[PDB]
Design a protein around this ligand. Structure first.
Ligand SMILES: Nc1ncnc2c1ncn2[C@@H]1O[C@H](COP(=O)(O)OP(=O)(O)O)[C@@H](O)[C@H]1O
Lengths: 244, 53, 100, 53
Protein backbone atom coordinates (compact mmCIF):
# COMPACT_ATOMS: atom_id res chain seq x y z
CA UNK A 1 0.00 0.00 0.00
CA UNK A 2 3.03 2.31 0.34
CA UNK A 3 4.01 1.81 -3.32
CA UNK A 4 2.59 4.17 -5.94
CA UNK A 5 2.25 2.85 -9.47
CA UNK A 6 3.90 4.69 -12.35
CA UNK A 7 3.60 4.75 -16.14
CA UNK A 8 6.78 4.48 -18.20
CA UNK A 9 6.99 5.97 -21.69
CA UNK A 10 9.12 4.02 -24.16
CA UNK A 11 10.49 6.03 -27.07
CA UNK A 12 12.12 4.57 -30.18
CA UNK A 13 15.52 5.60 -31.54
CA UNK A 14 17.00 3.74 -34.49
CA UNK A 15 15.64 0.21 -34.12
CA UNK A 16 15.40 0.05 -30.32
CA UNK A 17 13.00 1.03 -27.54
CA UNK A 18 14.38 3.42 -24.92
CA UNK A 19 13.02 4.56 -21.56
CA UNK A 20 12.26 8.21 -22.25
CA UNK A 21 12.26 10.49 -19.22
CA UNK A 22 11.36 9.33 -15.73
CA UNK A 23 8.39 7.32 -14.44
CA UNK A 24 5.26 9.47 -14.45
CA UNK A 25 2.32 9.67 -12.08
CA UNK A 26 -0.66 7.71 -13.39
CA UNK A 27 -3.55 9.98 -14.33
CA UNK A 28 -6.80 8.67 -12.78
CA UNK A 29 -9.24 7.25 -15.31
CA UNK A 30 -12.20 9.27 -14.01
CA UNK A 31 -10.21 12.47 -14.64
CA UNK A 32 -10.69 12.02 -18.40
CA UNK A 33 -14.36 12.06 -19.43
CA UNK A 34 -14.98 11.14 -23.07
CA UNK A 35 -18.64 10.15 -23.40
CA UNK A 36 -21.51 8.39 -21.64
CA UNK A 37 -20.20 4.84 -22.01
CA UNK A 38 -17.26 4.84 -24.42
CA UNK A 39 -14.73 4.52 -21.59
CA UNK A 40 -16.71 1.67 -20.03
CA UNK A 41 -17.00 -0.14 -23.37
CA UNK A 42 -13.29 0.20 -24.11
CA UNK A 43 -12.28 -0.89 -20.60
CA UNK A 44 -14.61 -3.89 -20.73
CA UNK A 45 -13.29 -4.95 -24.14
CA UNK A 46 -9.68 -4.62 -22.99
CA UNK A 47 -10.36 -6.58 -19.80
CA UNK A 48 -12.08 -9.33 -21.78
CA UNK A 49 -9.18 -9.51 -24.23
CA UNK A 50 -6.53 -9.63 -21.50
CA UNK A 51 -8.32 -11.99 -19.11
CA UNK A 52 -8.96 -14.67 -21.77
CA UNK A 53 -5.59 -15.72 -23.24
CA UNK A 54 -6.65 -19.38 -23.39
CA UNK A 55 -9.32 -18.49 -25.94
CA UNK A 56 -6.82 -17.19 -28.49
CA UNK A 57 -4.14 -19.87 -28.14
CA UNK A 58 -6.56 -22.81 -28.37
CA UNK A 59 -8.12 -21.54 -31.60
CA UNK A 60 -4.74 -20.70 -33.13
CA UNK A 61 -5.51 -17.00 -33.57
CA UNK A 62 -2.88 -14.33 -32.80
CA UNK A 63 -3.18 -12.73 -29.36
CA UNK A 64 -3.24 -9.28 -30.94
CA UNK A 65 -5.91 -6.57 -30.80
CA UNK A 66 -6.12 -3.03 -32.13
CA UNK A 67 -8.21 0.07 -31.42
CA UNK A 68 -8.83 3.29 -33.34
CA UNK A 69 -9.92 6.66 -31.93
CA UNK A 70 -10.91 9.36 -34.42
CA UNK A 71 -12.24 12.80 -33.55
CA UNK A 72 -11.50 16.51 -33.35
CA UNK A 73 -8.06 17.44 -32.00
CA UNK A 74 -7.77 18.15 -28.31
CA UNK A 75 -10.64 15.82 -27.41
CA UNK A 76 -8.58 13.85 -24.89
CA UNK A 77 -7.40 10.82 -26.83
CA UNK A 78 -3.78 10.56 -25.68
CA UNK A 79 -4.83 11.44 -22.13
CA UNK A 80 -7.37 8.61 -22.16
CA UNK A 81 -4.72 6.22 -23.51
CA UNK A 82 -2.38 7.18 -20.68
CA UNK A 83 -5.15 6.78 -18.09
CA UNK A 84 -6.08 3.35 -19.46
CA UNK A 85 -2.44 2.25 -19.40
CA UNK A 86 -2.15 3.42 -15.80
CA UNK A 87 -5.30 1.50 -14.89
CA UNK A 88 -3.94 -1.64 -16.56
CA UNK A 89 -0.45 -1.02 -15.09
CA UNK A 90 1.00 -1.24 -18.61
CA UNK A 91 3.50 1.09 -20.27
CA UNK A 92 2.86 3.20 -23.36
CA UNK A 93 5.36 2.98 -26.22
CA UNK A 94 4.71 6.26 -28.01
CA UNK A 95 5.89 6.37 -31.62
CA UNK A 96 5.37 9.11 -34.21
CA UNK A 97 5.08 7.44 -37.61
CA UNK A 98 4.70 10.90 -39.19
CA UNK A 99 8.48 11.21 -38.88
CA UNK A 100 10.50 10.03 -41.88
CA UNK A 101 13.33 8.70 -39.70
CA UNK A 102 11.78 5.22 -39.52
CA UNK A 103 11.04 3.02 -42.53
CA UNK A 104 8.60 0.17 -43.09
CA UNK A 105 11.18 -2.44 -42.07
CA UNK A 106 12.24 -0.23 -39.15
CA UNK A 107 8.59 0.16 -38.14
CA UNK A 108 8.06 -3.61 -38.26
CA UNK A 109 11.19 -4.21 -36.18
CA UNK A 110 10.14 -1.64 -33.58
CA UNK A 111 6.60 -3.03 -33.39
CA UNK A 112 7.92 -6.60 -33.09
CA UNK A 113 10.41 -5.85 -30.30
CA UNK A 114 7.96 -3.90 -28.12
CA UNK A 115 8.34 -4.65 -24.39
CA UNK A 116 6.02 -7.18 -22.79
CA UNK A 117 2.93 -5.93 -20.93
CA UNK A 118 3.32 -2.62 -22.77
CA UNK A 119 1.00 -0.59 -24.98
CA UNK A 120 2.09 0.95 -28.28
CA UNK A 121 0.64 4.25 -29.51
CA UNK A 122 1.00 5.47 -33.10
CA UNK A 123 -0.42 8.97 -33.48
CA UNK A 124 -0.79 11.03 -36.67
CA UNK A 125 -1.57 7.85 -38.60
CA UNK A 126 -3.16 9.97 -41.34
CA UNK A 127 0.17 11.44 -42.45
CA UNK A 128 1.86 8.17 -43.41
CA UNK A 129 -1.31 6.81 -45.01
CA UNK A 130 -1.79 10.02 -47.01
CA UNK A 131 1.73 9.82 -48.45
CA UNK A 132 10.81 5.81 -45.47
CA UNK A 133 7.18 6.90 -45.62
CA UNK A 134 4.59 4.38 -46.77
CA UNK A 135 0.82 3.91 -46.80
CA UNK A 136 0.31 0.17 -47.31
CA UNK A 137 3.68 -0.84 -45.85
CA UNK A 138 2.58 0.05 -42.32
CA UNK A 139 -0.62 -2.01 -42.56
CA UNK A 140 1.32 -4.90 -44.09
CA UNK A 141 3.79 -4.73 -41.19
CA UNK A 142 0.92 -4.63 -38.69
CA UNK A 143 -0.47 -7.93 -39.98
CA UNK A 144 2.97 -9.52 -39.70
CA UNK A 145 3.31 -12.31 -37.14
CA UNK A 146 6.46 -10.63 -35.78
CA UNK A 147 5.14 -9.65 -32.35
CA UNK A 148 4.92 -10.82 -28.74
CA UNK A 149 2.14 -11.97 -26.42
CA UNK A 150 -0.70 -9.46 -25.94
CA UNK A 151 0.35 -6.79 -28.44
CA UNK A 152 -2.21 -4.05 -27.81
CA UNK A 153 -2.00 -1.23 -30.35
CA UNK A 154 -3.99 2.01 -30.33
CA UNK A 155 -4.74 4.17 -33.37
CA UNK A 156 -5.53 7.87 -33.03
CA UNK A 157 -6.21 10.39 -35.79
CA UNK A 158 -8.07 13.63 -36.37
CA UNK A 159 -10.15 12.29 -39.27
CA UNK A 160 -11.09 8.82 -40.52
CA UNK A 161 -11.99 9.60 -44.15
CA UNK A 162 -8.33 9.67 -45.20
CA UNK A 163 -7.98 5.99 -44.24
CA UNK A 164 -9.60 2.95 -45.87
CA UNK A 165 -11.96 0.19 -44.69
CA UNK A 166 -9.20 -2.35 -45.42
CA UNK A 167 -7.38 -1.08 -42.33
CA UNK A 168 -10.36 -1.97 -40.11
CA UNK A 169 -10.61 -5.77 -40.00
CA UNK A 170 -9.93 -8.70 -37.66
CA UNK A 171 -6.21 -9.11 -37.13
CA UNK A 172 -6.08 -5.30 -37.37
CA UNK A 173 -7.99 -2.40 -35.80
CA UNK A 174 -11.01 -4.06 -34.19
CA UNK A 175 -13.07 -1.62 -32.09
CA UNK A 176 -13.00 1.86 -33.58
CA UNK A 177 -14.63 4.65 -31.58
CA UNK A 178 -15.46 8.27 -32.40
CA UNK A 179 -14.67 10.85 -29.75
CA UNK A 180 -16.77 13.99 -30.06
CA UNK A 181 -17.28 17.40 -28.50
CA UNK A 182 -18.46 17.89 -24.93
CA UNK A 183 -22.07 17.08 -24.06
CA UNK A 184 -24.23 18.18 -21.14
CA UNK A 185 -23.22 15.13 -19.10
CA UNK A 186 -19.57 15.62 -20.04
CA UNK A 187 -19.68 19.32 -19.17
CA UNK A 188 -21.31 18.79 -15.77
CA UNK A 189 -18.87 15.96 -15.02
CA UNK A 190 -15.97 18.28 -15.82
CA UNK A 191 -17.47 21.06 -13.71
CA UNK A 192 -17.89 18.81 -10.68
CA UNK A 193 -14.43 17.29 -11.19
CA UNK A 194 -12.65 20.65 -11.34
CA UNK A 195 -14.61 22.07 -8.40
CA UNK A 196 -15.05 19.46 -5.64
CA UNK A 197 -18.60 20.04 -4.41
CA UNK A 198 -21.18 22.52 -5.68
CA UNK A 199 -24.83 22.72 -6.69
CA UNK A 200 -25.61 20.28 -9.53
CA UNK A 201 -28.14 22.80 -10.86
CA UNK A 202 -25.29 25.30 -11.20
CA UNK A 203 -23.30 22.77 -13.22
CA UNK A 204 -26.35 22.06 -15.40
CA UNK A 205 -26.85 25.77 -16.06
CA UNK A 206 -23.14 26.10 -16.87
CA UNK A 207 -23.36 23.20 -19.34
CA UNK A 208 -26.50 24.59 -20.97
CA UNK A 209 -24.95 28.05 -21.32
CA UNK A 210 -21.80 26.58 -22.89
CA UNK A 211 -23.86 24.46 -25.29
CA UNK A 212 -25.91 27.50 -26.29
CA UNK A 213 -22.80 29.64 -26.78
CA UNK A 214 -20.72 27.12 -28.74
CA UNK A 215 -21.64 24.01 -30.71
CA UNK A 216 -18.14 22.58 -31.31
CA UNK A 217 -16.58 23.31 -27.92
CA UNK A 218 -13.62 21.07 -27.21
CA UNK A 219 -12.64 19.69 -23.79
CA UNK A 220 -9.21 21.30 -24.15
CA UNK A 221 -10.90 24.69 -24.53
CA UNK A 222 -13.03 23.93 -21.46
CA UNK A 223 -9.93 23.08 -19.42
CA UNK A 224 -8.19 26.24 -20.61
CA UNK A 225 -11.19 28.35 -19.66
CA UNK A 226 -11.31 26.69 -16.24
CA UNK A 227 -7.63 27.49 -15.75
CA UNK A 228 -8.43 31.19 -16.21
CA UNK A 229 -10.95 31.12 -13.35
CA UNK A 230 -9.16 28.59 -11.15
CA UNK A 231 -10.82 28.41 -7.72
CA UNK A 232 -13.55 30.72 -9.04
CA UNK A 233 -16.75 28.89 -9.99
CA UNK A 234 -19.17 31.82 -9.70
CA UNK A 235 -16.96 34.10 -11.79
CA UNK A 236 -16.54 31.38 -14.40
CA UNK A 237 -20.32 30.90 -14.56
CA UNK A 238 -20.84 34.65 -14.91
CA UNK A 239 -18.16 34.71 -17.64
CA UNK A 240 -19.71 32.01 -19.85
CA UNK A 241 -21.47 34.66 -21.92
CA UNK A 242 -18.06 36.29 -22.45
CA UNK A 243 -16.91 33.30 -24.51
CA UNK A 244 -19.90 33.50 -26.88
CA UNK B 1 22.48 -30.99 -0.30
CA UNK B 2 21.11 -27.53 -0.98
CA UNK B 3 23.42 -27.24 -4.00
CA UNK B 4 21.54 -29.99 -5.82
CA UNK B 5 18.33 -28.92 -7.54
CA UNK B 6 16.35 -31.79 -6.00
CA UNK B 7 16.32 -29.89 -2.69
CA UNK B 8 13.61 -27.44 -3.75
CA UNK B 9 11.64 -30.13 -5.59
CA UNK B 10 11.65 -32.43 -2.56
CA UNK B 11 10.64 -29.59 -0.25
CA UNK B 12 7.74 -28.62 -2.51
CA UNK B 13 6.65 -32.25 -2.74
CA UNK B 14 6.78 -32.47 1.06
CA UNK B 15 4.73 -29.31 1.54
CA UNK B 16 2.16 -30.68 -0.90
CA UNK B 17 1.96 -34.23 0.49
CA UNK B 18 1.76 -33.07 4.12
CA UNK B 19 -0.80 -30.27 3.90
CA UNK B 20 -1.11 -29.86 7.68
CA UNK B 21 2.49 -29.15 8.68
CA UNK B 22 2.45 -27.24 11.96
CA UNK B 23 6.10 -26.21 11.52
CA UNK B 24 6.98 -24.50 8.25
CA UNK B 25 8.91 -21.62 6.71
CA UNK B 26 7.99 -19.13 4.00
CA UNK B 27 9.59 -18.37 0.64
CA UNK B 28 8.44 -15.20 -1.12
CA UNK B 29 8.68 -14.80 -4.90
CA UNK B 30 8.82 -11.04 -5.53
CA UNK B 31 9.34 -9.59 -9.00
CA UNK B 32 8.90 -5.93 -9.94
CA UNK B 33 8.27 -5.94 -13.67
CA UNK B 34 8.92 -2.88 -15.81
CA UNK B 35 6.27 -0.13 -15.66
CA UNK B 36 6.05 -0.70 -11.89
CA UNK B 37 4.16 -4.00 -11.91
CA UNK B 38 4.78 -5.97 -8.72
CA UNK B 39 4.14 -9.73 -8.61
CA UNK B 40 4.16 -11.50 -5.24
CA UNK B 41 3.44 -15.07 -4.19
CA UNK B 42 4.00 -16.93 -0.93
CA UNK B 43 5.42 -20.45 -1.21
CA UNK B 44 5.40 -22.30 2.10
CA UNK B 45 8.23 -24.71 2.88
CA UNK B 46 8.96 -27.12 5.72
CA UNK B 47 10.85 -25.49 8.58
CA UNK B 48 14.29 -26.66 9.73
CA UNK B 49 14.15 -29.49 12.24
CA UNK B 50 12.51 -32.91 12.26
CA UNK B 51 9.34 -33.82 10.39
CA UNK B 52 7.48 -37.10 10.01
CA UNK B 53 5.48 -38.15 6.95
CA UNK C 1 28.49 -31.12 -45.82
CA UNK C 2 28.80 -27.91 -43.77
CA UNK C 3 26.08 -28.61 -41.21
CA UNK C 4 25.49 -30.06 -37.74
CA UNK C 5 23.73 -33.13 -36.35
CA UNK C 6 20.04 -33.44 -37.29
CA UNK C 7 19.71 -30.51 -39.69
CA UNK C 8 15.99 -30.48 -40.43
CA UNK C 9 15.06 -28.03 -43.18
CA UNK C 10 11.54 -27.18 -44.38
CA UNK C 11 10.65 -25.79 -47.81
CA UNK C 12 7.46 -23.81 -48.37
CA UNK C 13 6.26 -22.16 -51.58
CA UNK C 14 3.04 -21.14 -53.29
CA UNK C 15 3.70 -23.16 -56.46
CA UNK C 16 5.97 -26.07 -57.35
CA UNK C 17 6.15 -25.68 -61.15
CA UNK C 18 8.76 -22.92 -60.89
CA UNK C 19 11.20 -25.36 -59.27
CA UNK C 20 12.88 -28.41 -60.83
CA UNK C 21 12.92 -32.15 -60.07
CA UNK C 22 16.67 -31.89 -59.39
CA UNK C 23 15.83 -30.13 -56.12
CA UNK C 24 13.80 -33.14 -54.93
CA UNK C 25 16.25 -35.98 -54.28
CA UNK C 26 17.90 -37.86 -51.39
CA UNK C 27 20.31 -35.59 -49.58
CA UNK C 28 17.82 -32.82 -50.38
CA UNK C 29 14.06 -32.34 -50.07
CA UNK C 30 12.76 -35.84 -49.32
CA UNK C 31 9.03 -35.87 -48.48
CA UNK C 32 7.17 -33.19 -50.42
CA UNK C 33 3.51 -32.66 -49.58
CA UNK C 34 0.76 -30.61 -51.23
CA UNK C 35 -1.49 -28.60 -48.93
CA UNK C 36 -4.87 -27.85 -50.46
CA UNK C 37 -8.12 -26.03 -49.75
CA UNK C 38 -10.46 -26.99 -46.93
CA UNK C 39 -12.46 -30.21 -47.20
CA UNK C 40 -15.60 -31.35 -45.42
CA UNK C 41 -13.57 -33.04 -42.68
CA UNK C 42 -11.30 -30.01 -42.40
CA UNK C 43 -14.25 -27.62 -42.24
CA UNK C 44 -16.10 -29.59 -39.56
CA UNK C 45 -12.88 -29.94 -37.57
CA UNK C 46 -12.40 -26.17 -37.71
CA UNK C 47 -16.02 -25.57 -36.73
CA UNK C 48 -15.79 -27.84 -33.69
CA UNK C 49 -12.39 -26.40 -32.74
CA UNK C 50 -13.56 -22.78 -32.83
CA UNK C 51 -16.82 -23.56 -31.01
CA UNK C 52 -16.25 -26.05 -28.17
CA UNK C 53 -19.30 -28.30 -28.33
CA UNK C 54 -22.19 -28.23 -30.80
CA UNK C 55 -24.25 -30.52 -33.00
CA UNK C 56 -22.03 -32.39 -35.49
CA UNK C 57 -24.90 -32.24 -38.00
CA UNK C 58 -24.74 -28.45 -37.76
CA UNK C 59 -21.02 -28.55 -38.54
CA UNK C 60 -21.66 -30.90 -41.47
CA UNK C 61 -24.32 -28.57 -42.87
CA UNK C 62 -21.95 -25.63 -42.42
CA UNK C 63 -19.20 -27.47 -44.29
CA UNK C 64 -21.55 -28.50 -47.10
CA UNK C 65 -22.86 -24.95 -47.47
CA UNK C 66 -19.32 -23.56 -47.61
CA UNK C 67 -18.28 -26.17 -50.18
CA UNK C 68 -21.32 -25.36 -52.31
CA UNK C 69 -20.71 -21.61 -52.07
CA UNK C 70 -16.96 -21.64 -52.76
CA UNK C 71 -14.66 -24.20 -54.37
CA UNK C 72 -11.27 -22.65 -53.51
CA UNK C 73 -12.01 -21.50 -49.96
CA UNK C 74 -8.84 -21.06 -47.93
CA UNK C 75 -8.48 -21.79 -44.20
CA UNK C 76 -7.34 -18.20 -43.64
CA UNK C 77 -10.62 -16.98 -45.12
CA UNK C 78 -12.50 -19.41 -42.88
CA UNK C 79 -10.70 -18.10 -39.80
CA UNK C 80 -11.39 -14.51 -40.84
CA UNK C 81 -15.08 -15.27 -41.32
CA UNK C 82 -15.20 -16.98 -37.92
CA UNK C 83 -13.64 -13.88 -36.35
CA UNK C 84 -16.55 -11.81 -37.67
CA UNK C 85 -19.09 -14.01 -35.86
CA UNK C 86 -16.99 -14.81 -32.79
CA UNK C 87 -19.11 -16.56 -30.15
CA UNK C 88 -21.95 -16.69 -32.69
CA UNK C 89 -22.34 -20.10 -34.34
CA UNK C 90 -25.99 -19.79 -35.38
CA UNK C 91 -25.47 -16.37 -36.95
CA UNK C 92 -22.38 -17.63 -38.77
CA UNK C 93 -24.35 -20.60 -40.12
CA UNK C 94 -27.16 -18.30 -41.25
CA UNK C 95 -24.57 -16.01 -42.87
CA UNK C 96 -22.87 -18.69 -44.99
CA UNK C 97 -25.09 -17.81 -47.96
CA UNK C 98 -23.91 -14.21 -47.56
CA UNK C 99 -20.37 -15.20 -48.58
CA UNK C 100 -21.54 -16.86 -51.82
CA UNK D 1 4.71 -29.78 -14.61
CA UNK D 2 4.87 -26.08 -13.65
CA UNK D 3 7.13 -25.25 -16.62
CA UNK D 4 5.52 -24.26 -19.93
CA UNK D 5 7.47 -24.95 -23.09
CA UNK D 6 8.24 -22.13 -25.49
CA UNK D 7 9.35 -21.80 -29.12
CA UNK D 8 12.25 -19.47 -29.90
CA UNK D 9 12.58 -17.82 -33.32
CA UNK D 10 16.15 -17.36 -34.55
CA UNK D 11 16.63 -14.60 -37.12
CA UNK D 12 19.76 -14.07 -39.21
CA UNK D 13 21.65 -10.77 -39.48
CA UNK D 14 24.91 -10.64 -41.40
CA UNK D 15 26.39 -14.11 -40.93
CA UNK D 16 25.01 -14.89 -37.46
CA UNK D 17 21.85 -16.26 -35.87
CA UNK D 18 20.11 -13.98 -33.38
CA UNK D 19 17.28 -14.58 -30.91
CA UNK D 20 14.51 -12.47 -32.42
CA UNK D 21 11.85 -11.29 -30.00
CA UNK D 22 10.86 -13.19 -26.87
CA UNK D 23 9.95 -16.86 -26.35
CA UNK D 24 6.51 -17.56 -27.78
CA UNK D 25 3.69 -19.80 -26.61
CA UNK D 26 3.66 -23.09 -28.51
CA UNK D 27 0.61 -23.42 -30.74
CA UNK D 28 -1.06 -26.82 -30.19
CA UNK D 29 -0.70 -29.20 -33.12
CA UNK D 30 -4.41 -30.04 -33.26
CA UNK D 31 -5.17 -26.33 -33.70
CA UNK D 32 -3.83 -26.48 -37.27
CA UNK D 33 -5.78 -28.90 -39.47
CA UNK D 34 -4.24 -29.49 -42.90
CA UNK D 35 -5.72 -32.72 -44.28
CA UNK D 36 -6.90 -36.21 -43.33
CA UNK D 37 -3.49 -37.71 -42.64
CA UNK D 38 -0.80 -35.33 -43.87
CA UNK D 39 0.00 -34.14 -40.34
CA UNK D 40 0.21 -37.73 -39.09
CA UNK D 41 2.46 -38.76 -41.98
CA UNK D 42 4.80 -35.80 -41.47
CA UNK D 43 4.95 -36.32 -37.69
CA UNK D 44 5.64 -40.04 -38.11
CA UNK D 45 8.40 -39.40 -40.64
CA UNK D 46 10.02 -36.77 -38.41
CA UNK D 47 9.83 -39.04 -35.36
CA UNK D 48 11.37 -41.92 -37.31
CA UNK D 49 14.18 -39.68 -38.57
CA UNK D 50 14.95 -38.25 -35.12
CA UNK D 51 14.63 -41.48 -33.12
CA UNK D 52 17.04 -43.44 -35.36
CA UNK D 53 20.39 -41.62 -35.40
N1 LIG E 1 -12.04 14.45 -21.31
C1 LIG E 1 -11.07 15.24 -20.80
N2 LIG E 1 -10.93 15.40 -19.46
C2 LIG E 1 -9.97 16.19 -18.94
N3 LIG E 1 -9.08 16.87 -19.68
C3 LIG E 1 -9.11 16.81 -21.03
C4 LIG E 1 -10.13 15.97 -21.68
N4 LIG E 1 -9.94 16.08 -23.00
C5 LIG E 1 -8.88 16.92 -23.19
N5 LIG E 1 -8.39 17.35 -22.02
C6 LIG E 1 -7.25 18.28 -21.86
O1 LIG E 1 -6.88 18.77 -23.15
C7 LIG E 1 -5.49 18.58 -23.41
C8 LIG E 1 -5.32 17.92 -24.77
O2 LIG E 1 -3.94 17.84 -25.10
P1 LIG E 1 -3.40 16.82 -26.22
O3 LIG E 1 -2.94 15.55 -25.55
O4 LIG E 1 -2.43 17.57 -27.11
O5 LIG E 1 -4.70 16.47 -27.10
P2 LIG E 1 -5.43 15.04 -26.96
O6 LIG E 1 -5.65 14.87 -25.47
O7 LIG E 1 -6.69 15.18 -27.76
O8 LIG E 1 -4.43 14.06 -27.54
C9 LIG E 1 -4.93 17.72 -22.30
O9 LIG E 1 -3.85 18.40 -21.66
C10 LIG E 1 -6.06 17.50 -21.32
O10 LIG E 1 -5.69 18.01 -20.03
Amino acid sequence: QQEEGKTVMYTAVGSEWRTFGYPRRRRPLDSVVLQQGLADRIVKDIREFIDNPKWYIDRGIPYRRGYLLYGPPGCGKSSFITALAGELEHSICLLSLTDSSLSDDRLNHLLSVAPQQSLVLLEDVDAAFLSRLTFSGLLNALDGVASTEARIVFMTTNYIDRLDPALIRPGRVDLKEYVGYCSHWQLTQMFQRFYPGQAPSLAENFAEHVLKATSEISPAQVQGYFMLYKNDPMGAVHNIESLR
Amino acid sequence: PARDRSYAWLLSWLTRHSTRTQHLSVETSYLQHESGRISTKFEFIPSPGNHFI
